Amino acid sequence: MVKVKFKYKGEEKEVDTSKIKKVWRAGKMVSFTYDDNGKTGRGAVSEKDAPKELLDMLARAEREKK
DNA sequence: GTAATTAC
DNA sequence: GTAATTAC
C-alpha cells in the first residue's frame, strides 16, 4: 500500500503504485500513467517527493530489455 | 523552450 | 498539435 499524492490540473489526487502502468523521467520530473477506473490517467511529481517504491519502478523501467 | 510521453 | 507535469 504505497500511495502517491500529487496535484494535476488544480485537483489533488492519490494513486496506489499498483495502479501505475508506466513511469519515466524528464529532468527532475517523474511522470507516469495509471489505470483510472476505465480510462488512463496522468500525473507527475518531483523526484524529491517520490516514494522509493515509485523510484524503483522507474529504475526497473530503465533496465527493461523489453 | 526543452526534457519524455500521454490523453485529449 | 498541444496542455500538462517540475526544473532549468
From Swiss-Prot:
Record flagged with keyword Cytoplasm: yes
Other facts: Sac7a and Sac7b are truncated versions of the Sac7d protein, most likely resulting from post-translational processing, or degradation during isolation.
GO molecular function, one term: DNA binding
Keyword Repressor found: no
UniProt PTM: Lys-5 was 70% monomethylated in form 7a, 25% in form 7b, and 20% in form 7d. Lys-7 was 50% monomethylated in form 7a, 40% in form 7b, and 50% in form 7d.
UniProt-listed SUPFAM superfamilies: Chromo domain-like
NCBIfam families: Sul7d
Functional summary from the UniProt entry: Can constrain negative DNA supercoils. May be involved in maintaining the integrity of the genome at high temperature.
Temperature dependence: Hyperthermostable.
Recorded effect of pH on activity: Highly stable from pH 0 to pH 12.
Subcellular location(s) of the protein: Cytoplasm
Protein name: DNA-binding protein 7d
Keywords per UniProt: Cytoplasm, DNA-binding, Methylation
Location of N6-methyllysine modifications: K5, K7
Pfam families named among the record's database cross-references: 7kD_DNA_binding
UniProt cross-references to InterPro entries, sorted A to Z: Chromo-like_dom_sf (IPR016197), DNA-bd_7a-e_arc (IPR003212)
Main location: cytoplasm
GO (cellular component) term, any one: cytoplasm
Organism superkingdom: Archaea
Subunit structure: Monomer.
Family, as annotated: Belongs to the 7 kDa DNA-binding/endoribonuclease P2 family.
